[PDB]
Scaffold this active site. Sequence first.
Site, mmCIF file in Angstrom:
data_model
loop_
_atom_site.group_PDB
_atom_site.id
_atom_site.type_symbol
_atom_site.label_atom_id
_atom_site.label_comp_id
_atom_site.label_asym_id
_atom_site.label_seq_id
_atom_site.Cartn_x
_atom_site.Cartn_y
_atom_site.Cartn_z
ATOM 1 N N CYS A 103 6.390 -0.344 6.256
ATOM 2 C CA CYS A 103 5.051 0.176 6.589
ATOM 3 C C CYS A 103 4.958 0.807 7.982
ATOM 4 O O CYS A 103 4.037 1.575 8.267
ATOM 5 C CB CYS A 103 3.982 -0.910 6.410
ATOM 6 S SG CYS A 103 4.241 -2.432 7.360
ATOM 7 N N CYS A 114 1.435 0.291 8.573
ATOM 8 C CA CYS A 114 1.274 -0.678 9.659
ATOM 9 C C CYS A 114 1.792 -0.151 11.004
ATOM 10 O O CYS A 114 2.447 0.892 11.060
ATOM 11 C CB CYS A 114 1.966 -1.997 9.303
ATOM 12 S SG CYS A 114 3.769 -1.907 9.267
#
EC number: 3.2.2.-
Length: 249
Positions: free
Chosen positions: A75, A157
Site C-alpha cells: 500500500c 497507505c
Amino acid sequence: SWRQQWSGPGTTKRFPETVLARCVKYTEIHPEMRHVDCQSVWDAFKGAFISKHPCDITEEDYQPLMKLGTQTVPCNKILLWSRIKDLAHQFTQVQRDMFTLEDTLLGYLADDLTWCGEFATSKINYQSCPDWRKDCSNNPVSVFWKTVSRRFAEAACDVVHVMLDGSRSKIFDKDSTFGSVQVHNLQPEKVQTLEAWVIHGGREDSRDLCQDPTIKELESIISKRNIQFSCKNIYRPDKFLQCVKNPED
Ligand SMILES: NC(=O)c1ccc[n+]([C@@H]2O[C@H](COP(=O)(O)O)[C@@H](O)[C@H]2O)c1
C-alpha cells in the site's frame, strides 16, 4: 436495417483476444498471480457487460471480475495520476517496486482499450460505444475504471504520490477520476500524506505550479480528511526519470 449508433468509438478490434493475451502475459511475469485462470478472468470481464444495454452497467457488474483479479500490492508503493499517464508508467518502469493501477492485473487488462455490448445478445459492438457526455456516464468503460480506481486508491497507505498535468486549465480537476473518486477514498488511518507532482509541459514558463489555485483546492480537500499535503514541480520529465533512484546526490 437499423442498428443503434453511439457517439463514442467502438470496441477495440480483437478486444477478446487482447484481454486474454494480456492476462496470460501478466500471470507469466507475476508469480504472485501465476495460477489465475485467464479464461475465467475473460468470462467474468465479458459477463460484466455483454447482453446488457451499455447504459445499464453498475459497479456490481464488475464484482465477479474484481474478485478473480484480487491483488493488493504494498500500500506504500502506490502512484496515482490524472489526465496523463505516460510519465507515471515510465516512472514505474524505473522504480519497479512502485505501482500505478495500470501495473496491476485489472488495470493492465483494460488500459488503452474500449468495449461495450448490447441488450439481449452476446455481441460485442465494434462500431460504437456510448460517450460519457453525449450518451450516458454509466457505460461499460467508465463504470469499470470508476470501480477499480476506487478499490486501488482506498487500499493505499503512508505517502500517496499523484502526478498531475500542469499543462491544463485545471491542474487539479475535481471532475477527474482522481479528483472525484480517488482523493475521497484515501483513509487517514493509513495515509499520512498526499504528495502532488505537477508535470510541466512546454508552455508553463517555468512557473511554480504548486502555487496554482487548483492545487490549493486539492490541499483543502486533503486537509479536511486530516491528511497532510505536499507539492513538487516536475520541470523536466527526462531529468526527473534519471534522478529517480538517486534524488539527493
Ligand atoms: N487507465 C485508464 O485509462 C484510467 C481511466 C480512468 C481512471 N484511471 C485511474 O484513475 C486516475 C486517472 O483518472 P483521471 O485522469 O480521470 O484522474 C489514475 O490514478 C488511474 O489509475 C485510469
